[PDB]
Design an enzyme around this catalytic site. Structure first.
Site, PDB file in Angstrom:
ATOM      1  N   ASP A  25       0.848  -1.229   0.000  1.00  0.00           N
ATOM      2  CA  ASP A  25       0.000   0.000   0.000  1.00  0.00           C
ATOM      3  C   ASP A  25       0.867   1.256   0.000  1.00  0.00           C
ATOM      4  O   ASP A  25       1.346   1.737   1.057  1.00  0.00           O
ATOM      5  CB  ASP A  25      -0.917  -0.051   1.201  1.00  0.00           C
ATOM      6  CG  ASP A  25      -1.920   1.100   1.230  1.00  0.00           C
ATOM      7  OD1 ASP A  25      -1.881   1.942   0.317  1.00  0.00           O
ATOM      8  OD2 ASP A  25      -2.767   1.077   2.129  1.00  0.00           O
ATOM      9  N   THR A  26       1.041   1.832  -1.184  1.00  0.00           N
ATOM     10  CA  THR A  26       1.833   3.040  -1.314  1.00  0.00           C
ATOM     11  C   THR A  26       1.240   4.223  -0.642  1.00  0.00           C
ATOM     12  O   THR A  26       1.934   5.226  -0.400  1.00  0.00           O
ATOM     13  CB  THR A  26       2.136   3.404  -2.754  1.00  0.00           C
ATOM     14  OG1 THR A  26       0.935   3.512  -3.482  1.00  0.00           O
ATOM     15  CG2 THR A  26       3.041   2.401  -3.326  1.00  0.00           C
ATOM     16  N   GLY A  27      -0.070   4.163  -0.367  1.00  0.00           N
ATOM     17  CA  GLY A  27      -0.733   5.244   0.327  1.00  0.00           C
ATOM     18  C   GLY A  27      -0.709   5.150   1.865  1.00  0.00           C
ATOM     19  O   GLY A  27      -1.361   5.921   2.548  1.00  0.00           O
TER      20      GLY A  27
HETATM   21  C1  LIG Z   1      -9.075   5.564  -0.222  1.00  0.00           C
HETATM   22  C2  LIG Z   1      -9.781   4.217  -0.349  1.00  0.00           C
HETATM   23  C3  LIG Z   1     -11.007   4.111  -1.239  1.00  0.00           C
HETATM   24  C4  LIG Z   1      -9.298   2.963   0.349  1.00  0.00           C
HETATM   25  N1  LIG Z   1     -10.427   2.033   0.457  1.00  0.00           N
HETATM   26  C5  LIG Z   1     -10.671   1.106  -0.494  1.00  0.00           C
HETATM   27  O1  LIG Z   1      -9.979   0.909  -1.506  1.00  0.00           O
HETATM   28  C6  LIG Z   1     -11.938   0.319  -0.250  1.00  0.00           C
HETATM   29  C7  LIG Z   1     -12.887  -0.076  -1.390  1.00  0.00           C
HETATM   30  N2  LIG Z   1     -12.459   0.324   1.100  1.00  0.00           N
HETATM   31  C8  LIG Z   1     -12.385  -0.715   1.955  1.00  0.00           C
HETATM   32  O2  LIG Z   1     -11.911  -1.796   1.646  1.00  0.00           O
HETATM   33  O3  LIG Z   1     -12.863  -0.504   3.329  1.00  0.00           O
HETATM   34  C9  LIG Z   1     -13.908  -1.269   3.920  1.00  0.00           C
HETATM   35  C10 LIG Z   1     -14.260  -0.861   5.353  1.00  0.00           C
HETATM   36  C11 LIG Z   1     -15.539  -0.461   5.708  1.00  0.00           C
HETATM   37  C12 LIG Z   1     -15.836  -0.122   7.025  1.00  0.00           C
HETATM   38  C13 LIG Z   1     -14.875  -0.147   8.025  1.00  0.00           C
HETATM   39  C14 LIG Z   1     -13.590  -0.539   7.688  1.00  0.00           C
HETATM   40  C15 LIG Z   1     -13.302  -0.890   6.360  1.00  0.00           C
HETATM   41  C16 LIG Z   1      -8.498   3.181   1.625  1.00  0.00           C
HETATM   42  O4  LIG Z   1      -9.034   3.717   2.581  1.00  0.00           O
HETATM   43  N3  LIG Z   1      -7.235   2.721   1.476  1.00  0.00           N
HETATM   44  C17 LIG Z   1      -6.074   2.682   2.398  1.00  0.00           C
HETATM   45  C18 LIG Z   1      -5.721   1.228   2.524  1.00  0.00           C
HETATM   46  C19 LIG Z   1      -6.977   0.473   3.037  1.00  0.00           C
HETATM   47  C20 LIG Z   1      -7.651  -0.462   2.219  1.00  0.00           C
HETATM   48  C21 LIG Z   1      -8.782  -1.147   2.678  1.00  0.00           C
HETATM   49  C22 LIG Z   1      -9.266  -0.879   3.975  1.00  0.00           C
HETATM   50  C23 LIG Z   1      -8.602   0.044   4.791  1.00  0.00           C
HETATM   51  C24 LIG Z   1      -7.478   0.710   4.321  1.00  0.00           C
HETATM   52  C25 LIG Z   1      -4.862   3.494   1.944  1.00  0.00           C
HETATM   53  O5  LIG Z   1      -4.221   3.094   0.707  1.00  0.00           O
HETATM   54  C26 LIG Z   1      -5.166   4.939   1.727  1.00  0.00           C
HETATM   55  O6  LIG Z   1      -4.060   5.502   1.046  1.00  0.00           O
HETATM   56  C27 LIG Z   1      -5.376   5.843   2.913  1.00  0.00           C
HETATM   57  C28 LIG Z   1      -5.410   7.295   2.375  1.00  0.00           C
HETATM   58  C29 LIG Z   1      -5.847   8.319   3.375  1.00  0.00           C
HETATM   59  C30 LIG Z   1      -4.892   8.892   4.231  1.00  0.00           C
HETATM   60  C31 LIG Z   1      -5.272   9.801   5.197  1.00  0.00           C
HETATM   61  C32 LIG Z   1      -6.617  10.167   5.289  1.00  0.00           C
HETATM   62  C33 LIG Z   1      -7.564   9.636   4.416  1.00  0.00           C
HETATM   63  C34 LIG Z   1      -7.169   8.703   3.453  1.00  0.00           C
HETATM   64  N4  LIG Z   1      -4.302   5.625   3.882  1.00  0.00           N
HETATM   65  C35 LIG Z   1      -4.488   5.276   5.141  1.00  0.00           C
HETATM   66  O7  LIG Z   1      -5.573   5.059   5.610  1.00  0.00           O
HETATM   67  C36 LIG Z   1      -3.218   5.171   5.910  1.00  0.00           C
HETATM   68  N5  LIG Z   1      -3.017   6.439   6.610  1.00  0.00           N
HETATM   69  C37 LIG Z   1      -1.883   7.078   6.629  1.00  0.00           C
HETATM   70  O8  LIG Z   1      -0.868   6.702   6.071  1.00  0.00           O
HETATM   71  C38 LIG Z   1      -1.826   8.421   7.333  1.00  0.00           C
HETATM   72  C39 LIG Z   1      -1.569   9.539   6.298  1.00  0.00           C
HETATM   73  N6  LIG Z   1      -0.680   8.465   8.209  1.00  0.00           N
HETATM   74  C40 LIG Z   1      -0.793   8.475   9.531  1.00  0.00           C
HETATM   75  O9  LIG Z   1      -1.830   8.382  10.166  1.00  0.00           O
HETATM   76  O10 LIG Z   1       0.431   8.667  10.240  1.00  0.00           O
HETATM   77  C41 LIG Z   1       0.320   8.816  11.691  1.00  0.00           C
HETATM   78  C42 LIG Z   1       0.170  10.279  12.090  1.00  0.00           C
HETATM   79  C43 LIG Z   1      -0.948  10.718  12.838  1.00  0.00           C
HETATM   80  C44 LIG Z   1      -1.050  12.069  13.174  1.00  0.00           C
HETATM   81  C45 LIG Z   1      -0.068  12.978  12.763  1.00  0.00           C
HETATM   82  C46 LIG Z   1       1.033  12.548  12.009  1.00  0.00           C
HETATM   83  C47 LIG Z   1       1.151  11.191  11.678  1.00  0.00           C
HETATM   84  C48 LIG Z   1      -3.226   4.023   6.890  1.00  0.00           C
HETATM   85  C49 LIG Z   1      -3.523   2.708   6.164  1.00  0.00           C
HETATM   86  C50 LIG Z   1      -1.903   3.989   7.688  1.00  0.00           C
END
Ligand SMILES: CC(C)[C@H](NC(=O)[C@H](C)NC(=O)OCc1ccccc1)C(=O)N[C@@H](Cc1ccccc1)[C@@H](O)[C@H](O)[C@H](Cc1ccccc1)NC(=O)[C@@H](NC(=O)[C@H](C)NC(=O)OCc1ccccc1)C(C)C
Ligand SMILES: O=C(O)c1ccc2ccccc2c1Br
Ligand SMILES: O=C(O)c1ccc2ccccc2c1Br
Ligand SMILES: [Br-]
EC number: 3.4.23.16
Lengths: 99, 99
Positions: A25-27
């Site tokens: 996961d690059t994101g």
């Molecule tokens: C954007 C999407 C449509 C994606 N979802 C999907 O593709 C699908 C269809 N959804 C899906 O499968 O979800 C079903 C579901 C439903 C209900 C409950 C739970 C789950 C998604 O959320 N994708 C993520 C991976 C994922 C996949 C499936 C399920 C869960 C997670 C990351 O790639 C995506 O890139 C996000 C992007 C993002 C970032 C920030 C805000 C909003 C969106 N990153 C993340 O969620 C990551 N966060 C981060 O990297 C943040 C930026 N860093 C971080 O928090 O650093 C700590 C920090 C905190 C405070 C200050 C400084 C640092 C996480 C996995 C670590």
């Protein structure tokens, strides 16, 4: 290997004595795994994604194998519905995006 | 290009006649943009991630140019803190993961 993206980039990893599937996961800044036991006395940590923040446990110095490439680093564990391999490990195994 | 992952893979894009940056995100099925105006018909949709759920507007047949490479597809617009380029578009630009 070279992984196309028509499907989710799920790979097999080994961690905490268990074989699991995880998403490359690059994101993701960090690596976040579904509920499991790992050694160490963890520290709390906040991570955020679509939908908001979750508090998770941070385990440092954890060994992980990702398609057989070995790595050591910080792994988070919490209520993620899918095991996520983030950039902290992706860099270690020499993973790039290319086009 | 070949993008390493020591930093977030934020790249320049063009969408809706506007220059923006977006994250190339192998962990996203879908493309999700920060709240903006786009003309035309859309449908209410919901998507999931880590924080849980958000509500988005789904637009079809949207053109995004990504480091000079065209893609056209479904785009979701809503309360994300980052523009996200998902697999639906990454395949169109021939993006792969390599290790
Ligand atoms: C954007 C999407 C449509 C994606 N979802 C999907 O593709 C699908 C269809 N959804 C899906 O499968 O979800 C079903 C579901 C439903 C209900 C409950 C739970 C789950 C998604 O959320 N994708 C993520 C991976 C994922 C996949 C499936 C399920 C869960 C997670 C990351 O790639 C995506 O890139 C996000 C992007 C993002 C970032 C920030 C805000 C909003 C969106 N990153 C993340 O969620 C990551 N966060 C981060 O990297 C943040 C930026 N860093 C971080 O928090 O650093 C700590 C920090 C905190 C405070 C200050 C400084 C640092 C996480 C996995 C670590
Ligand atoms: O548990 C293993 O089989 C194993 C064995 C040796 C390792 C070496 C380095 C990183 C992970 C390792 C793992 Br995950
Ligand atoms: O990126 C360009 O090459 C470009 C060049 C000229 C422009 C002029 C007006 C608005 C956008 C423009 C853009 Br977006
Ligand atoms: Br809906």
């Amino acid at each position: 290997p070279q992984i196309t993206l028509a499907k989710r980039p799920l790979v097999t990893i080994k961690i905490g004595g268990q074989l699991k599937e995880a998403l490359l996961d690059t994101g993701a800044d960090d690596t976040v795994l579904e509920e499991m036991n790992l050694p160490g006395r963890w520290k709390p940590k906040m991570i955020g994604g679509i939908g908001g923040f979750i508090k998770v446990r941070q385990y440092d110095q954890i060994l992980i194998e990702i398609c057989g490439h070995k790595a050591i680093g910080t792994v988070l564990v919490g209520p993620t519905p899918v095991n996520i391999i983030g950039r902290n490990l992706l860099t270690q195994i020499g993973c790039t995006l290319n086009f």
